[PDB]
Amino acid sequence: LIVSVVLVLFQVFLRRGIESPEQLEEIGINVYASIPISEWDTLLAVGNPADLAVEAIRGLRTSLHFAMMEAKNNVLMISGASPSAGMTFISSNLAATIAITGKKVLFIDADLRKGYAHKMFGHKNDKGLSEFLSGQAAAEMIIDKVEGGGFDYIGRGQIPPNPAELLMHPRFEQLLNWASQNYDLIIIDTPPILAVTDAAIIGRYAGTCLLVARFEKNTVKEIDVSMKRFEQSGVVVKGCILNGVVKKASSYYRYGHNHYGYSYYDKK
Amino acid sequence: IDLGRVIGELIDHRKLIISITSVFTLFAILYALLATPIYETDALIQIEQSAPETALLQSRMILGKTIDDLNLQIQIEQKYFPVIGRGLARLMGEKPGNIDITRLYLPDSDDISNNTPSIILTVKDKENYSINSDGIQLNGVVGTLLNEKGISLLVNEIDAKPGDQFVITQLPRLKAISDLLKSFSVADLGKDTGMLTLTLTGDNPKRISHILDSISQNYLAQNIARQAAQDAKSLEFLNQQLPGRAVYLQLLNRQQELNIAKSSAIGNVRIIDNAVTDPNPVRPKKTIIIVIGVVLGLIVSVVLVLFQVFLRRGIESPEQLEEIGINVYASIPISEWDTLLAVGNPADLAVEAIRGLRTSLHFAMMEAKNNVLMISGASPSAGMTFISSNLAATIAITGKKVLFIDADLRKGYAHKMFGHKNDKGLSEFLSGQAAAEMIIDKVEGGGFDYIGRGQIPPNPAELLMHPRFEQLLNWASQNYDLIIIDTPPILAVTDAAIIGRYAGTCLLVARFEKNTVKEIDVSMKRFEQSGVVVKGCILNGVVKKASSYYRYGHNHYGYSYYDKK
Amino acid sequence: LATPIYETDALIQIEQSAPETALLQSRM
Ligand SMILES: Nc1ncnc2c1ncn2[C@@H]1O[C@H](COP(=O)(O)OP(=O)(O)O)[C@@H](O)[C@H]1O
Ligand SMILES: Nc1ncnc2c1ncn2[C@@H]1O[C@H](COP(=O)(O)OP(=O)(O)O)[C@@H](O)[C@H]1O
Ligand SMILES: [Mg+2]
Ligand SMILES: [Mg+2]
């Protein structure tokens, strides 16, 4: 018992990751949603629409409809601090929950380094975003439809040797200006900002930018460093999305709320 | 400081801690294995008191009788040249050679200090041997005694292998007694009983049992004699007093009564147990030695880490610079990979951090007077030339015309890093012996032009004050989209404060652990005092550290993001 | 799994008993 207690006592005093959205909001970071871990190449919003994580993404969809108004354009960039924080999970599922509301959504996989959205949607891998930015593809040949989705998507294409320099091409702003007229919302999936600078280049042409914070993997200072690295490059991050929340009794006692969410269905 | 801080410091210094602890444990293990094992023999003595018998046992009278019986003044030691040769020879399974000497008379130098004469016996075979005291070689054979050169020696039963040497010392009788008395102890074990526990320690397990048996038997023979000594002295004077006749017969009755009393007077000492040696050595205690080696090595590793933590003053995170109000535009990690890093390894983690600086500058260099960017720093070898030359390479691939001016007229080596026609650099232009068109050169694997420093001038700070330098920048500011000027450090020389007058943007490069926060604050205020506004700082040479992750939330190193193929 | 270790005892009547203790534990 005393060994179990000192190990628990160490892990408690040593952990630095986020424990609740309150930690982010103490710094002045708007948390627009807290997405729980979905215990359930599929789209969660399509495979299990009644999932508890999809219900939390719908709450993000309605929170964005109020936050994305008064924006320059209908382009929403979703980035984050660290890789595997849930930027592709959230942006692709957020696009699926906004597509069922009857809106025309375009999901651009601007992760020209490790983007796999084409594998997640079913792909004609040729003529992605890379082939367009390098000039060897037209804007009409790169848009593809998600089968069980409801929104179009642009894959990353072949991994270029200069991903950050391709995104600086004036073609990228031409694609967004063209797509901003044929779609009600453009969601851009990007690499993490503390890894590469691609999101700071893309965030110049996005009217709204949201960061995805992983629940225990990311730190509050890690998300603050990310928001200030965007602002230093002229990108205004609207807020944050806490992802991967798990039910914890420590949050219920430290704060009043564990921020996990309730299940609400008629069991039949 | 808290738990996370100290644990991060222990994780960072884990190599130092492990190395120091392993060195201490290695020394402890080498001592525990190479130290000569010291055994202990014990015997049991019963007293019919025992407090005066203890002081009698440890007396030079009793102990001196043992030295004479066993010839303990003939010290023989196996010859091993190092202080560890004996221990390692025991580990190699080599049985220690022993020679039995029954007669030894050295020439007895008895000089100022060396009261213990010594010789060296080198075994030649099972029968004969050699002797060399001070170079005088003498051949001896087992059996036949040797009386030559004033050296008497009788060696019996050489039990060793040929080639082995032995140091044969003839130590004085008191030194032999003092050595025995030091290892010989007496106890009572009941504090009331007539039981005496005689213990004796030594490196030879068989010898110390023979010595403790001799001490017991000598004290046994001696003790019986002692009680008779009162009646023996009476008997001694009676024999001297043996010469009326009736009294002579009365003396004869006393004559035999003293003979019987002395003979039958054996008492007060019984030896319950004879000396046997405990085969397990009592010293060295290997477990307590190795355990102390671990614990001592850990507390030494901890205090050294505790000192280096409280003594270090360098920058640990960009947060330290931003607490003072210094904008940190990038944190460049150490590139573990005369080459340009942005060209040799474009996918490097440090080049990815410089690209983040390229985009941060595109937003910071707007609203500036001109397109000239000066990059300076506090201390030399902080990364000003590494960052400015690689920043120019990452801005050149974006299709911009970049000019890299190596305005380090003192120790500039950019021409060596780019491939050089070393003639006609910036010095030759400032001194008037070169045109602006003849000094610009193209970086081969680059994409930007560069102006080398040229020949090192005797007046570098006075050349930069020439109006030609502003003419070059005004000319280059029309033919290039960006001019990057590499400069010497400001806390070394004043060249950067002269150049910074004509640069629209100035950035300082801070080395990660080498520079201090006050060192960078002193640099920014030395620029402002000369009319140069430093836009911000670039932290260079960041390394992954767990202490930063616990002290601050972020280690500021950055993530690797590539598809592994 | 540890081997069980038993204990036997006896009672001795002595007509002192401090020198008798060291005599019992002697190698003789
Ligand atoms: N809230 C969540 N619930 C369940 N699975 C998640 C959640 N967030 C992420 N994941 C999963 O963890 C992985 C990481 O998501 P990903 O979009 O690839 O991260 P990022 O783009 O930020 O690097 C994905 O396979 C995703 O399905
Ligand atoms: N972040 C870094 N990663 C790897 N090497 C570096 C880094 N910064 C500097 N160096 C190397 O350390 C040396 C010092 O760089 P340098 O430009 O000569 O310093 P300065 O001009 O400030 O005196 C160079 O050889 C450089 O290649
Ligand atoms: Mg992604
Ligand atoms: Mg330099």
CB–CB of B233/B71 below 8 Å?
A: no
The kind and range of the H/E element at B183 are: helix B173-183
| Ligand 2 mutation target, pool B337, B348, B385, most atoms within 8 A of CB | B385
CB–CB of B529/B304 below 8 Å?
A: no
Q: Which residue has the tokens 């001896």?
A: B140
In a domain, A97, yes or no: yes
Q: What whole-number distance in Å separates Cα of residue B373 and Cα of residue B523? A: 17
CB–CB of A232/B363 below 8 Å?
A: yes
CB–CB of A248/A21 below 8 Å?
A: no
Bridge partners, B167 (sequence order): B77, B120
Specified resolution (Å): 2.9
Q: What whole-number distance in Å separates Cα of residue B206 and Cα of residue B212? A: 10
Gapped junctions in chain A, after residues (C–N > 2.5 Å): 40
Q: What are phi and psi of B312, to 5 degrees?
A: -75, 140
The kind and range of the H/E element at B429 are: helix B426-430
Domain extent, residue A195, equals 21-254
Q: What whole-number distance in Å separates Cα of residue A32 and Cα of residue B533? A: 39
Q: What share of chain A is helix, strand, coil (3-state, %, to 5)?
A: 40, 15, 45
CB–CB of A196/A227 below 8 Å?
A: no
Which of A173, A163, A206 lies closest to A187, judged by CA?
Answer: A206
Q: What are phi and psi of B105, to 5 degrees?
A: -130, 110
Structure tokens given for A194: 């503390």
- Structural domain tally of chain A? 1
Experimental method for this entry?
cryo-EM
Q: First-to-last CA distance in chain A?
A: 44
Q: What whole-number distance in Å separates Cα of residue B232 and Cα of residue B230? A: 5
C-alpha distances out from residue B499 to A229, B454, B486, Å: 29, 17, 10
In a domain, A260, yes or no: no
Question: What HEC string does B148-179 produce?
Answer: ECCEEEEEEEEECCCCCEEEEEECCHHHHHHH
Does residue B46 sit at the C interface (CB-CB below 8 Å)? yes
Structure tokens given for B387: 């960052």
Q: What whole-number distance in Å separates Cα of residue B123 and Cα of residue B427? A: 81
Structure tokens given for B67: 């030295």
Structure tokens given for B534: 């430093």
Residue nearest to atom 15 of ligand 1 (CA): A86
Please state the atom number of ligand 2 nearest to the C-alpha of residue B377.
Answer: 22
Q: What whole-number distance in Å separates Cα of residue B486 and Cα of residue B372? A: 11
The kind and range of the H/E element at B456 are: none
Q: What whole-number distance in Å separates Cα of residue B447 and Cα of residue B397? A: 7
Q: What whole-number distance in Å separates Cα of residue A171 and Cα of residue A167? A: 8
Q: Which residue has the tokens 């506090």?
A: B378
Residues with CB under 5 A from ligand 4 (ion): B 384-385, 408
- Cross-chain residue pair A10–B3, CB shorter than 8 Å: yes
Neighbours of B187 (CB within 10 A): 15
Query: Residue-wise over B149-159: b if at least 16 C-beta within 10 A, else e?
Result: eebebbbeebe
- Cross-chain residue pair B272–C18, CB shorter than 8 Å: no
C-alpha distances out from residue B242 to B137, B230, B231, B232, Å: 60, 19, 16, 15
Q: How far is the CA of B381 from the centre of ligand 2 (A)?
A: 6
Q: What whole-number distance in Å separates Cα of residue B272 and Cα of residue B197? A: 10
Q: How many helices (H) and strands (E) does chain C have?
A: 1, 0
> Residues, chain A, total?
268
Question: Residue B52 corresponds to which amino acid?
Answer: P
Question: Residue B389 corresponds to which amino acid?
Answer: S
Structure tokens given for B424: 């006609």
Q: What whole-number distance in Å separates Cα of residue A234 and Cα of residue A254? A: 36
Question: Residue B378 corresponds to which amino acid?
Answer: A
CB–CB of A91/A116 below 8 Å?
A: no
Which of B454, B357, B463, B473 lies closest to B414, judged by CA?
Answer: B454
CATH code where residue A127 lies: 3.40.50.300
In a domain, A59, yes or no: yes
For A235, the closest chain B residue by CA position comes to B363
Taking the C-alpha atoms of A245, A246, A249 and A251 in order, what is their torsion angle to the nearest 10 degrees?
-10
Q: Which residue has the tokens 């920014």?
A: B524
Q: What whole-number distance in Å separates Cα of residue B5 and Cα of residue B291? A: 28
Q: What whole-number distance in Å separates Cα of residue A218 and Cα of residue A17? A: 5
Structure tokens given for B28: 């402890």
CA-based nearest distance B72→chain C, Å: 28
For B351, the closest chain A residue by CA position comes to A196
In a domain, A4, yes or no: no
Which of A166, A168, A204 lies closest to A188, judged by CA?
Answer: A204
